[PDB]
Amino acid sequence: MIWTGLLVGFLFGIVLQRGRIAFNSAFRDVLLFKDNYLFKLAVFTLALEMILFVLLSQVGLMQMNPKPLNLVGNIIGGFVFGLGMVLAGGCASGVTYRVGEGLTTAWFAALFYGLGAYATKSGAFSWWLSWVGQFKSPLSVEESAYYVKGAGPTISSVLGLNPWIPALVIAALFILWAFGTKTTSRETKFNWKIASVCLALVAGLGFITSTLSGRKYGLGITGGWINLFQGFLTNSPLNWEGLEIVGIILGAGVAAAVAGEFKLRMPKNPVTYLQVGIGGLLMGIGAVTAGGCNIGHFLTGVPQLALSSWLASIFFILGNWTMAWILFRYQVSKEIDVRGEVCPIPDVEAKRAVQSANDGEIILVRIDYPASKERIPETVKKLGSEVLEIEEAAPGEWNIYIKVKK
Amino acid sequence: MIWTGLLVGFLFGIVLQRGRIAFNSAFRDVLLFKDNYLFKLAVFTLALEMILFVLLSQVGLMQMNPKPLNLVGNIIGGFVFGLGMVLAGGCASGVTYRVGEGLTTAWFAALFYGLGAYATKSGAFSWWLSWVGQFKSPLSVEESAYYVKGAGPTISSVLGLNPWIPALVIAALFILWAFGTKTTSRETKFNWKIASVCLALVAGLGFITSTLSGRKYGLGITGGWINLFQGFLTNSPLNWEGLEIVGIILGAGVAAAVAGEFKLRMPKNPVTYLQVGIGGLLMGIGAVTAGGCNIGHFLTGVPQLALSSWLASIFFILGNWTMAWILFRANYQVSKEIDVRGEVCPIPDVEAKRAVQSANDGEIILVRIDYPASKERIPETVKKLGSEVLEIEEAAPGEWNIYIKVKK
Ligand SMILES: CCCCCCCC/C=C/CCCCCCCC(=O)OC[C@H](O)CO
Ligand SMILES: CCCCCCCC/C=C/CCCCCCCC(=O)OC[C@H](O)CO
Ligand SMILES: CCCCCCCC/C=C/CCCCCCCC(=O)OC[C@H](O)CO
Ligand SMILES: CCCCCCCC/C=C/CCCCCCCC(=O)OC[C@H](O)CO
Ligand SMILES: CCCCCCCC/C=C/CCCCCCCC(=O)OC[C@H](O)CO
Ligand SMILES: CCCCCCCC/C=C/CCCCCCCC(=O)OC[C@H](O)CO
Ligand SMILES: CCCCCCCC/C=C/CCCCCCCC(=O)OC[C@H](O)CO
Ligand SMILES: CCCCCCCC/C=C/CCCCCCCC(=O)OC[C@H](O)CO
Ligand SMILES: CCCCCCCC/C=C\CCCCCCCC(=O)OC[C@H](O)CO
Ligand SMILES: CCCCCCCC/C=C\CCCCCCCC(=O)OC[C@H](O)CO
Ligand SMILES: CCCCCCCC/C=C\CCCCCCCC(=O)OC[C@H](O)CO
Ligand SMILES: CCCCCCCC/C=C\CCCCCCCC(=O)OC[C@H](O)CO
Ligand SMILES: CCCCCCCC/C=C\CCCCCCCC(=O)OC[C@H](O)CO
Ligand SMILES: CCCCCCCC/C=C\CCCCCCCC(=O)OC[C@H](O)CO
Numbered sequence A: 001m002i003w004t005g006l007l008v009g010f011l012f013g014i015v016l017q018r019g020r021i022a023f024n025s026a027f028r029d030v031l032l033f034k035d036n037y038l039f040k041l042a043v044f045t046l047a048l049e050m051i052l053f054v055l056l057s058q059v060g061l062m063q064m065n066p067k068p069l070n071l072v073g074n075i076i077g078g079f080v081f082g083l084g085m086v087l088a089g090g091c092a093s094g095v096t097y098r099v100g101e102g103l104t105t106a107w108f109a110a111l112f113y114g115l116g117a118y119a120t121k122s123g124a125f126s127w128w129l130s131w132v133g134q135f136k137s138p139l140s141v142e143e144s145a146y147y148v149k150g151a152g153p154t155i156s157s158v159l160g161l162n163p164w165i166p167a168l169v170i171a172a173l174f175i176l177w178a179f180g181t182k183t184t185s186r187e188t189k190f191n192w193k194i195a196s197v198c199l200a201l202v203a204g205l206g207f208i209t210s211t212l213s214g215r216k217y218g219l220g221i222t223g224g225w226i227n228l229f230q231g232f233l234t235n236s237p238l239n240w241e242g243l244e245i246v247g248i249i250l251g252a253g254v255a256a257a258v259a260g261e262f263k264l265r266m267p268k269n270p271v272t273y274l275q276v277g278i279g280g281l282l283m284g285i286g287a288v289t290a291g292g293c294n295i296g297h298f299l300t301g302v303p304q305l306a307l308s309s310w311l312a313s314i315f316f317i318l319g320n321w322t323m324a325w326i327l328f329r330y331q332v333s334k335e336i337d338v339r340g341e342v343c344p345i346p347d348v349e350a351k352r353a354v355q356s357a358n359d360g361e362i363i364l365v366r367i368d369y370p371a372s373k374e375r376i377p378e379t380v381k382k383l384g385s386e387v388l389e390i391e392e393a394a395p396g397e398w399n400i401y402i403k404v405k406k
Numbered sequence B: 001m002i003w004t005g006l007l008v009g010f011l012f013g014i015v016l017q018r019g020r021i022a023f024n025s026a027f028r029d030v031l032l033f034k035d036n037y038l039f040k041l042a043v044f045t046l047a048l049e050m051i052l053f054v055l056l057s058q059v060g061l062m063q064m065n066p067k068p069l070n071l072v073g074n075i076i077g078g079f080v081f082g083l084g085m086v087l088a089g090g091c092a093s094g095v096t097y098r099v100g101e102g103l104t105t106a107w108f109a110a111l112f113y114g115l116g117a118y119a120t121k122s123g124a125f126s127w128w129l130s131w132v133g134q135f136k137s138p139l140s141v142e143e144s145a146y147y148v149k150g151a152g153p154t155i156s157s158v159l160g161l162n163p164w165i166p167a168l169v170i171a172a173l174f175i176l177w178a179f180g181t182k183t184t185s186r187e188t189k190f191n192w193k194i195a196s197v198c199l200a201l202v203a204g205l206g207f208i209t210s211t212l213s214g215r216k217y218g219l220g221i222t223g224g225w226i227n228l229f230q231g232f233l234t235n236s237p238l239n240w241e242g243l244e245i246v247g248i249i250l251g252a253g254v255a256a257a258v259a260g261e262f263k264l265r266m267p268k269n270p271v272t273y274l275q276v277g278i279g280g281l282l283m284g285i286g287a288v289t290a291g292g293c294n295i296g297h298f299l300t301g302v303p304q305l306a307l308s309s310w311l312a313s314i315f316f317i318l319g320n321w322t323m324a325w326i327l328f329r330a331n332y333q334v335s336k337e338i339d340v341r342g343e344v345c346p347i348p349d350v351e352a353k354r355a356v357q358s359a360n361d362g363e364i365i366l367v368r369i370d371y372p373a374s375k376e377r378i379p380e381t382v383k384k385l386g387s388e389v390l391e392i393e394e395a396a397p398g399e400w401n402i403y404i405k406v407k408k
Helices: A004-021 A025-033 A037-058 A070-087 A093-103 A104-120 A124-135 A155-159 A164-179 A191-213 A222-236 A240-258 A272-288 A294-304 A307-327 A343-355 A377-380 B002-020 B025-031 B039-058 B069-086 B090-101 B106-124 B126-135 B155-159 B162-180 B192-212 B221-236 B239-258 B271-290 B294-304 B309-328 B347-357 B372-385
Strands: A336-337 A362-367 A386-392 A398-403 B336-340 B365-368 B388-394 B400-405
Touching: A004 A093, A004 A191, A004 A240, A025 A037, A025 A070, A025 A093, A025 A294, A025 A307, A037 A164, A037 A191, A037 A294, A070 A307, A093 A104, A093 A222, A093 A240, A093 A272, A093 A294, A104 A124, A104 A222, A104 A272, A104 A307, A104 B106, A104 B162, A104 B221, A124 A272, A124 B039, A155 A164, A155 A307, A191 A294, A222 A240, A222 A272, A222 B106, A222 B221, A240 A362, A272 A307, A272 B106, A272 B347, A294 A307, A307 B039, A336 A343, A336 B155, A336 B309, A343 A362, A343 A377, A343 A398, A343 B336, A377 A386, A377 A398, B002 B090, B002 B192, B002 B239, B025 B039, B025 B069, B025 B090, B025 B294, B025 B309, B039 B192, B039 B294, B069 B126, B069 B271, B069 B294, B069 B309, B090 B106, B090 B239, B090 B271, B090 B294, B106 B126, B106 B221, B126 B271, B155 B162, B155 B309, B162 B365, B192 B239, B192 B294, B221 B347, B271 B309, B294 B309, B336 B347, B347 B365, B347 B372, B347 B400, B365 B372, B372 B388, B372 B400
Parallel strands: A336 A362, B336 B365
Antiparallel strands: A362 A398, A386 A398, B365 B400, B388 B400
16 A cells, blocks of 8 residues: 555656646745746646545545644744745755756755754754644544544634535635636646646545555655655654655656656756755754645645645745745857756846847857746747747757847 | 863864875775875874873773674675775765865765664664674673773784783884885875874874763764764764764864865766765765774774774775776966866876876966865876976865976
8 A cells, every 4th residue: 555655656746847846936936027827737736636635535535634723833834944945946845856857956955854854853853843732723623524533624614614615616716716817828738737637636646545555644745755764764664655755756757857858967056055955954844843845735735625734835935935035036149058047047047138138139048957948938928039949958958049139 | 071072073173174184085096096195194193093092091091992893794894885985985084074175075975974874773774784793703802901891802802912012013013114115295284294193192182082971982983973863863962973073074164264275066077966975875884884984993993903993994995996996997378278176086186197198298287176185186296297387376265276387
């Protein structure tokens, strides 16, 4: 049973890698650049999961298990996890799958993420988690077809409604907005509509299989990394979530390689390793304090209508916003080289290069992250210019050619 | 008492950084390049430590505590630790102080070193350590002024001699060879003679203070990294050796910064991270299997005349050699420039040598480096080729331009 985590994690990783599904980017870019592509993906997926999780519970394939409510932990830990997201150059699922893509910064961030989460759970930061534990809400639900006994409060349970009703109302609202609203364009072939459907299916598969293996929950990140570290350092057995992490990495790597997008990568400046290192530590403290991360709380907990998960997600986003302001703000006439610069940067340095350019000029942009080669084309068409061709130099490296137009 | 580890480690770290004392380089370059500078440093320090450890035991400031003999562990672990050295681009002390010099590769290699050693002591590789433990030799010494009760066999104990006698004989032979033999030349101002005296003084100080904190041993590395990880991950208290590691890093960092040699650094090719990560893991498994590392066994154990330490050191060197073969088999006109910034030492020296030979008479050679050891080795490699170094200028902090005029 436990070995189904490797399979679910493998599929999870392919979807994350092919879709460029980075929630840290989704929260950040909806503030910095009014980009909602990844936010539409998130909302549509949450909507599908809302319908799927209650449907799968109805027919007896799983029970929902909302995480307990803890206002101090969910808020403070949520917020601190939001800060670390931006510093580490991605949320925990994003860091995890970028490991298999070949980014050494993500190797660094995952190490400090795992160690910091381990340390907050049972080591040098245990005292903090103990202090936060006193503020846990005693509110719980009773065993039913929908809920594991003793789980945390939901929108349904507070309202006294069958979980089907808020699930359908909220999802329909989510879908109305996702579809009745304009979305930022991207060149991703694995587009946000079909990625949402795949991601939710993988989500349901994970809740089912993980439950059979004795972990009554769907996809998560933080507990998988702690299960792996416990295994290596204490010889404890691996569990479903530990194997899911392995699967994510392996799946993202396979998917990157087959797409010719795998490449061992380094940042432009060495100090980034210090940044993503501190960032990963903040994430480990935040996630453990909060009781879950971008996946455990947001992708998996929100569609269960868990109050803890809605609350922690609000502060995931506010922390992301705080840290994002702290950190941010063929002839060939000019050449900009943004290889190894953090995923916001290539789009920003290519926008500023097209603006600070004369008409008819041909600009070369050098990138080595595939998310940017599907974002810069749209930023270019909304500036008057047009992309001539995206040519692959090395594997995992692409040259973008732009003809400026007024 | 435990806090004296930070002090001793801080001093230990300064001496390593200033002297460029990297034993992995010491073993490798004596085979690759017939370079014996760092090996005279090691041999002289060992000699000074042999006299010092016994003298300090005589007057009651410490007792020696030779590590136990284990042929399977000391040989196989020593050899595996040898392979890891070269892959990680530095031994365990070299990786540790390079963390303070700002090498992100050292950060990486330390992480996998600490985790691999922890996993070998009590995690997923403990099965191997258990299997090795069955071969432990029951040989041991009795409590005396010289020895902790139950410590492992020494040259003295096997010979039935007062520890002073093999100590003075072997050290005198070491000092004869060190001073009666030519040594490879270097530009290091903290030269191998004055560095050996300081290193041995710091070594003795560590043996004294650590013993007062309840760890009857001198300088080590692997235990401190495990003590650190245990504290962070399980909330256990830090001991003298964990604080010694912290000291080492702080010490090298201050020393590098004051010398204007500190710089956050990246390797030339990203795969180096995979390399040094695997290397650090090999070191963790090897050091724990061997019962000690370049410091715990070689620097601290050999002067105690501990059979375990002499034996494991033999295979540290054999493993280093094996891996060394697998792996290594201003206005100035400037005719050609070689940029070896971020390339792993021996490479700057190697690519600078090849560049001078593959060049025409009178050509001006610009070598770009960013590791401070290389700027004291390349000058001698150049003079033994006929050419001469015009000037070594500082480009960035931690970065140097070497200008070579090629003759004939
Ligand atoms: C296992 C061989 C390769 C190990 C490379 C470790 C490098 C350092 C990374 C640490 C965190 C993740 C470590 C995950 C390693 C697998 C988990 C493990 O050791 O499992 C033990 C098992 O559960 C007992 O029954
Ligand atoms: C804590 C971690 C536990 C362990 C997790 C391990 C998961 C599996 C690894 C995936 C990486 C995949 C590597 C893919 C390498 C691709 C190489 C490539 O694409 O080479 C191109 C070249 O140009 C020739 O065509
Ligand atoms: C040869 C290298 C250069 C010269 C280096 C000289 C260093 C000092 C010499 C010490 C050896 C003394 C040996 C004899 C000591 C007296 C006899 C003795 O102690 O005998 C013990 C007995 O055999 C059992 O307990
Ligand atoms: C108390 C009894 C035991 C003492 C134990 C420790 C002894 C250390 C010194 C040994 C002799 C060293 C002689 C070295 C003389 C110099 C080297 C030499 O002869 O030639 C080189 C040249 O003359 C100059 O650099
Ligand atoms: C009784 C034992 C024997 C006596 C032990 C005495 C204490 C140890 C040495 C202290 C400082 C040594 C470091 C100094 C090394 C040379 C420094 C130097 O040359 O610095 C000048 C300038 O700042 C750059 O060129
Ligand atoms: C107290 C503040 C600690 C900040 C840690 C940031 C670095 C985290 C990296 C982990 C790998 C290196 C492990 C060494 C960690 C030493 C610090 C530590 O927590 O030691 C245990 C503590 O002293 C027991 O009470
Ligand atoms: C987590 C494992 C244990 C970690 C233990 C850490 C102990 C303190 C050492 C830090 C590095 C060295 C000190 C920092 C040196 C900074 C030098 C610097 O910034 O130099 C500026 C430059 O010279 C232009 O002005
Ligand atoms: C244990 C060491 C640290 C591990 C940290 C997490 C690793 C996660 C997976 C990465 C794929 C690694 C293998 C795939 C890449 C191989 C290198 C490559 O593609 O090229 C190498 C070149 O051919 C010759 O140097
Ligand atoms: C370990 C790293 C932590 C990093 C982050 C530190 C943030 C600031 C600290 C605390 C805020 C506490 C906020 C809540 C405090 C009041 C809770 C409360 O109600 O206290 C009274 C109680 O209900 C009846 O005694
Ligand atoms: C329950 C209702 C839904 C059931 C079905 C859910 C699973 C869909 C299956 C595969 C994903 C396909 C991803 C879309 C892109 C496929 C590839 C493509 O469009 O072109 C590739 C190109 O030709 C170069 O390989
Ligand atoms: C260590 C033993 C296991 C080794 C690992 C074997 C994993 C299974 C292999 C392939 C299935 C998944 C295929 C994933 C395809 C990703 C999407 C993709 O890139 O599709 C091609 C497209 O043409 C690009 O544009
Ligand atoms: C096993 C892991 C061990 C620990 C691994 C982490 C590193 C520890 C050492 C030094 C940190 C501080 C180094 C100095 C920080 C400033 C350096 C500098 O000059 O920064 C310039 C930059 O542009 C400004 O943003
Ligand atoms: C007694 C038992 C002895 C043996 C026990 C331990 C076995 C490990 C052996 C060799 C590892 C060789 C180094 C492998 C490094 C990984 C590949 C890599 O990093 O590839 C790129 C690199 O640059 C290419 O040289
Ligand atoms: C230092 C002793 C530590 C403990 C034992 C570890 C193994 C020693 C290595 C070889 C044994 C034979 C040594 C024979 C004496 C001369 C050695 C020699 O020539 O030194 C190397 C180099 O050639 C100079 O240029």
